[PDB]
Amino acid sequence: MVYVNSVCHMKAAATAGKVEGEGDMQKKFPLAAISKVITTLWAIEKLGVDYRHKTVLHLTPTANGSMDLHVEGSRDPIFGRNLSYFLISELNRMKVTKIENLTFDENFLLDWLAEESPRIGGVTPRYETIEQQAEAVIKNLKESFSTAINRAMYSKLRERATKAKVFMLEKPTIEVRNISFLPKNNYKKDKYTGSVVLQSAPLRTILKRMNNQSNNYIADNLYWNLGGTAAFNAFAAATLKADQNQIVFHNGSGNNEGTTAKPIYNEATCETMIKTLYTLNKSLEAKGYKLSDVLSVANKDSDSTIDNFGGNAAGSMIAKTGTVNKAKTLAGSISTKEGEFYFAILLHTDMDQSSSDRGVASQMIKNKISQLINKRSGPKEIQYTEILALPFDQNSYLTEA
Amino acid sequence: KSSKALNEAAEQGDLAKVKNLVQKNKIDLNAQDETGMTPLMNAAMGGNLDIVKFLLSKKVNLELKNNGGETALAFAVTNDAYDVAEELIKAGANVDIIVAGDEGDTLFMRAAQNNKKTAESILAKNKSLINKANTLGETALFAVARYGTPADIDFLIKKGADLKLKNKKGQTALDVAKEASNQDTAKALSKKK
């Protein structure tokens, strides 16, 4: 079955004013991936919009002329294939082609498929012990970081880097003999250890990438990195003026934490999503940014879930989608001849009754957005150029600590 | 006998797990689950072009329908996986089909609102679909008149949409534009002849 749980909208202004819509604005409903809008605000509030995950690489010469490497981690939530390929290029620029002993500490996260299926839509792996985390990081280092580079994929990445004016070598390699976990408590460096820092892209771009893709891996790891559920609730009380009556979170993504038969979802009231949006926008404006720097733009962001959100929203809506078995959701803003308006639309679905519910819900949401645009005198196209959202940029090149 | 694990893997984009389960060779890939779903439908719904191409290499049936009456092509279009739609059309998927919902929208209609390229690929198979109405007597021109743009209107006018068609309530596209308060499409239609 498909139906409207709740709809809200509010004009974007200096003040959070009149709200109109449908249904109970103060009833909690499953959010699906519009949860990421909230995760996005929380990350920006705690870390700062332009924050950079600064992974430190401790390189010590061995007698054979290779390097030992200790990775001091920054918990970088987009560290996988692409950032690995870039690091390999970078190592070769510094004349490092061979690593003897590669150690890493408790903060080094590496999931090769961070920006790819099935990590985008999958249940994010949750490591209960540090051991379990270490063994999975070993697995990735051993099987992916150290193996023959995928020539076609490296080349696609480099084509993008080149559009982004970031240099990468045509054909770099790395060899790694030994890989093991070494806690930060126990790492101390040799007299001849030189150490260098890899800054990932600014947080706003990591967020733009996450929101474009609906990346569960990135959203869920941000949530843990920020302190998990306890830290989240304090954030919701202080920033959103919201307690369990308004909002309950289990993860950063909005993904199902339970079973197919017995789902558990992040829930909030439609009001809470409007607050989030207003506060996220104010935050970004205070630093000279816009909502389009972290959320997708209809039609204009090709590599996003709203690439094909047609209708009069094309080029005139900034939004995040959401999809779980029990819900289809959308949140963001529309730009119209009467100004910009925040909105949140929450629909119920039942995939267990029919998978056709997702498609039906999708076109209902689109038509609802079009209707809201119609009633505000039609679309006004947004000033925006497609952000190419790479996990590194021109300040990601290796520099001395 | 269908496979839950395979259907979920197809929907979610785990190509490695799909190939792994299909390699053991237990699974009939045309077996439909308790709601009529196939691995191909799940792959299309989830926008996973890699898994579609792999399943098409096994020569699955394109025209099976789930309980909602939808083929894999329909799952692709309705869920904005237009890269998958193109692959399925090139593979011989029937484009003269209905997508789910109360209205009986044609596949062409749903594509015309959302992706111009796939709308053209459909018409390239059957030009008359431009003017094929749904169950309420409405075509693409009616949908985009409500919820679309002047650019949409002229795209359809250029493909031969008929301005003067009436729906089952006796409304033209121009009438539904006005009823929807879409001043932009109303203007575009009411200047046209």
Numbering used by the authors:
A (entry chain A): 26 to 426
B (entry chain B): 28 to 220
What did the publication describing this PDB structure actually write?
The use by B. bacteriovorus (and related periplasmic predators) of multiple DD-endopeptidases to decrosslink prey wall, and our observation of specific neutralization of Bd3459 by Bd3460 raised the question as to whether a similar mechanism is used to protect against Bd0816. Bd0816 expression was toxic but was circumvented by mutating the active site Serine residue to Alanine (S58A). The resulting 2.48 Å structure of the Bd0816:Bd3460 complex reveals a conserved mode of binding between the ARP self-protection protein and both predatory DD-endopeptidase targets. Bd0816 is largely structurally equivalent to Bd3459, with a few small differences in surface-exposed loops (loops involved in Bd0816 oligomerization). It is striking that we observe a trimeric form of Bd0816 (burying 1,041 A2 of surface area per monomer, on the borderline for statistically significant oligomers). In-vitro characterization of the Bd0816:Bd3460 complex suggests the 1:1 heterodimer likely represents the dominant form in solution. Comparison of the residues involved in both complexes illustrates that the endopeptidase:self-protection protein interface is conserved, and is likely to be representative of protection mechanisms in related predators.
